[PDB]
Ligand binder design. Structure first.
Ligand SMILES: Nc1nc2c(ncn2[C@@H]2O[C@H](COP(=O)(O)OP(=O)(O)NP(=O)(O)O)[C@@H](O)[C@H]2O)c(=O)[nH]1
Ligand SMILES: [Mg+2]
Ligand SMILES: [N+]
Length: 403
């Protein structure tokens, strides 16, 4: 039908190491929420890991968006892959979150992508994290649980999250989900595992604030994905960063192309429900006229026409990860050519070091110039990640736009 706004909207999602239980939790959240609010459509595991290649490889590959709501708020929830080969997808997902749920297996404790996901979430501006310690059904020893909680809290502190403060909820995504299948009307207070999910929803409700959002500034929506809807046309999805978009607005597709192009918005939807108007914070699909899915792509931004100029050259302040943080073992020189990640954008760039700076080492805080091989929507103060050869090598912030 149409999307009726009854309450504030917040974007959350799931991050964490491969197999720790992100997707099972996502499904469990929809089922638990749905028993109290009949507007929530339940999403089973297979409804989320739905792609043939996900079934083939047995992992999440694509970020999925699901919807649920509490009495307090409306949630769009982005479930991200944990597999180390799908970090780019995770980054694009995190780039949409006003808060993240970090899933950590109680049986394994924090693992390399537990660290990498916390790191990267920060670099795309995730303001808050809640921890769901999953698979406690597998762990009898209360000591290991306390140990895992401790390790996770410390790891959050390392990347400037308030680790000693974040909620750490302990439960079983799977056992809650099973209970909801046996009784879809299972209410709060009736089942131990389901109540742990309510504990999570409460923490989300109360710990992740509703962001301050500017609907008056020019429309800007980073594109997270693009697909063709049979009968309708090309849809670009994403979280509106600022401003508003109505059907009939001409917008500009900015970045990743030599030149910017204009198109008319012909539909706006949030979770397959038609919006009058999309506003900042909304996670929407925008139907674009006259463009195919080969003419719009993830990493471009939709913008008010003329409100944004894409850039290629910038100065940056960069931290280069130690190998103990999963970074490089050796240093690099000017001409180093990794991948840079800004919000949903990923693009190859060239490191150009100052005259006199010959080599940058793991663990260095440093400043240099970057030249991207394609123009990209950039702003001063925009954080970014650096990756190369399938690992994260650095964290940076844009300090000066040169060109
Ligand atoms: N014992 C137990 N197993 C669980 C629990 N939650 C999930 N699992 C199991 O853990 C495995 C991984 O689940 P999944 O939700 O796919 O994790 P994921 O983090 O989404 N994986 P990925 O990184 O690929 O997206 C599955 O076999 C699932 O049944 C739990 O609470 N307890
Ligand atoms: Mg998954
Ligand atoms: N998925």
């Amino acid at each position: 039908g149409e999307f009726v706004r009854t309450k504030p909207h917040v974007n959350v999602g799931t991050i964490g190491h491969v197999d720790h239980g992100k997707t099972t939790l996502t499904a469990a959240l929809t089922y638990v929420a749905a028993a109290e609010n009949p507007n929530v459509e339940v999403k089973d595991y297979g409804d989320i890991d739905k792609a043939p290649e996900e079934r083939a490889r047995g992992i999440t590959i694509n970020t999925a968006h699901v919807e649920y709501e509490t009495a307090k708020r409306h949630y769009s929830h982005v479930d991200c892959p944990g597999h180390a080969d799908y970090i780019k997808n995770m980054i694009t997902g995190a780039a949409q979150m006003d808060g993240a749920i970090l899933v950590v297996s109680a049986a394994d404790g924090p693992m390399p992508q537990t660290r990498e996901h916390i790191l990267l979430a920060r670099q795309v501006g995730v303001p808050y994290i809640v921890v769901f310690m999953n698979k406690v059904d597998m762990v009898d020893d209360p000591e290991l649980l306390d140990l895992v909680e401790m390790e996770v809290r410390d790891l959050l502190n390392q990347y400037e999250f308030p680790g000693d403060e974040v909620p750490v909820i302990r439960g079983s995504a799977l056992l809650a989900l099973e209970q909801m299948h046996r009784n879809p009307k299972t209410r709060r207070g009736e089942n131990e595992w389901v109540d742990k999910i309510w504990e999570l929803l409460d923490a989300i409700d109360e710990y992740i604030p509703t962001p301050v959002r500017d609907v008056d500034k020019p429309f800007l929506m980073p594109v997270e994905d693009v697909f063709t809807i049979t009968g309708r046309g090309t849809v670009a999805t994403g979280r509106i960063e600022r401003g508003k978009v109505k059907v009939g607005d001409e917008v500009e597709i900015v970045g990743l192309a030599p030149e910017t192009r204009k198109t008319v918005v012909t539909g706006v939807e949030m979770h397959r429900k038609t919006l009058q108007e999309g506003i900042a914070g909304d996670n929407v699909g925008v139907l674009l006229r006259g463009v195919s899915r080969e003419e719009v792509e993830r990493g471009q931004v939709l913008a008010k026409p003329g409100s944004i100029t894409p850039h290629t050259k910038f100065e940056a302040s960069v931290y280069v990860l130690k190998k103990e943080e999963g970074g490089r073992h050796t240093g690099f020189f000017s001409g180093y050519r990794p991948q840079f990640y800004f919000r949903t954008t990923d693009v190859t760039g060239v490191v150009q070091l100052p005259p006199g700076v010959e080599m940058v080492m793991p663990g260095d805080n440093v400043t240099f110039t970057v030249e991207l091989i394609k123009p990209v929507a950039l702003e001063e103060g925009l954080r970014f990640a650096i990756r190369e050869g399938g690992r994260t090598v650095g964290a940076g912030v844009v300090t000066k736009i040169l060109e």
